[PDB]
Ligand binder design. Structure first.
Ligand SMILES: OC[C@@H]1O[C@@H](O[C@H]2[C@H](O[C@@H]3CO[C@@H](O[C@@H]4CO[C@@H](O)[C@H](O)[C@H]4O)[C@H](O)[C@H]3O)OC[C@@H](O)[C@@H]2O)[C@H](O)[C@H]1O
Length: 396
């Protein structure tokens, strides 16, 4: 059946999970005969099942969340993603111009975005004040100093979902972005060249954080978003002072609070500048969530991804996920004070890089993320991290 489509997403939080249910039925009532069969998938399994299912597109999902960056390009090159350049709506083209560049490859659009989520530090304002930190750290040393004060204050300074690998790696990403010059960074991503001292230095700076032992005790067995004891859950329940995460954070937090309501004292501050770093000041790194269409899918799928781009639907998305919607007009409904900061910093930032692992691809990304965890477990060095990236890069 054409008008029956298979829809894959990663919304495991209650409110966002329900948004998709309500969106599907809304699309089903406006387009009688259509049927959207939804599959909710935990984020850490998403890349695995998508790549596994799409090696035979005939029996894969019709509409699915993209993996992003080079990971999207891997699927595009493999013939697993449909060109939507001449298929996206005038609404999507107009309202979502800036986020559309993240789904644009070789001058061709391969998805409809729904949110833009820059990275940064999310923290408890109350835990900070309870440690004598009345001002956000502007530099990396200040951040280390503040973590010391939090540790003395009895609380774990930094929640880290190291079992999922990438949340730990995010500290390495940001440090590389801050240490390496914009060109060294660009060419390193484009050419997979990690020979510059940038990459070791960033690993060394991160090793210093590790040696302070200011993480939550079970960080190696802690996931990012699963349960009250996840790194996000620790922040939500004030068991930890902060964590380094994408702007999906407030929506994840409001799912893990004891009342499942928005975290009352959530604040945001950009990743600190690094003294002696050649990185461009104020350089953003983040994500852009968009949805792709199976090359073997019907027009019904196309009508569905464009339906997401609708301003009303984008706003309900912003409310349900407590995030920044991809649609510019839809951003008018954002009320979370920490998010309105991020939107402000978004409009006046020079660049926004994608996540480092998603920008380097599956092979390099997974190698890098694992290597960081190895170094953090004491079973690795900053040099091993770079060695791991170079090793995986041989495959492509
Ligand atoms: O390739 C897909 C997937 O991404 C990899 O993790 C990423 C990471 O993905 C983000 C993580 O968290 C998600 O936030 C969700 C938002 O709304 C809630 O309903 C929900 O339950 C949360 O899971 C988010 O949407 C993803 O974009 O982002 C940064 C990367 O460094 C990292 O690779 C996983 O390995 C892979 O399975």
């Amino acid at each position: 059946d054409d008008k029956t489509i298979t829809f894959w997403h990663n919304a495991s939080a209650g409110e966002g999970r329900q948004y998709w249910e309500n969106l599907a039925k809304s699309f089903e009532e406006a387009n009688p005969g259509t049927k959207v069969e939804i599959q909710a998938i935990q984020n850490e399994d998403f890349a695995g099942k998508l790549q596994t299912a799409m090696q035979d597109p005939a029996s894969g999902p019709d509409v699915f969340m993209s993996l992003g960056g080079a990971k999207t390009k891997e699927m595009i090159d493999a013939g697993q993603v449909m060109d939507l350049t001449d298929k996206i709506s005038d609404t999507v083209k107009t309202d979502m111009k800036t986020t559309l560049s993240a789904a644009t490859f070789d001058g061709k659009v391969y998805g409809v975005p729904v949110s833009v989520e820059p990275g940064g530090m999310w923290y408890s304002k109350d835990l900070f004040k309870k440690a004598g930190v009345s001002d956000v750290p502007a530099t990396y040393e200040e951040l280390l100093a503040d973590a010391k004060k939090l540790k003395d204050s009895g609380t774990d300074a930094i929640a880290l979902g190291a079992k999922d690998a990438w949340p730990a790696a995010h500290w390495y990403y940001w440090l590389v972005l801050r240490e390496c010059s914009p060109e060294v960074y660009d060419k390193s991503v484009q050419d997979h060249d990690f020979s510059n001292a940038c990459w070791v230095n960033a690993g060394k700076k991160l090793q210093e954080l590790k040696d302070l032992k200011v993480f939550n005790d079970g960080f190696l067995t802690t996931t990012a978003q699963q349960g009250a004891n996840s790194s996000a859950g620790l922040l939500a329940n004030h068991k930890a002072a902060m964590e380094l995460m994408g702007a999906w954070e407030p929506g994840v937090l409001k799912d893990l609070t004891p009342d499942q309501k928005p975290m009352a004292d959530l604040g945001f501050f950009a990743f600190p500048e690094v003294a002696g770093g050649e990185g461009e000041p104020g350089a953003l790194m983040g994500g852009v969530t968009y949805f792709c269409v199976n090359p073997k899918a019907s027009q019904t799928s196309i009508d569905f991804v464009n339906y997401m781009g609708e301003k009303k639907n984008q706003e309900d998305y912003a409310k349900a996920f407590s995030t920044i919607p991809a649609s510019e007009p839809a951003r008018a409904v954002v009320t979370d004070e920490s998010l309105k900061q991020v939107i402000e910093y978004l409009d006046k930032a020079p660049s926004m890089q994608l996540w480092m692992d998603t920008a380097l691809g599956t092979n390099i990304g997974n190698a890098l993320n694992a290597a960081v965890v190895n170094m953090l477990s004491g079973q690795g060095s900053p040099e091993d991290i770079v060695k791991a990236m170079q090793d995986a890069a041989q495959k492509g």
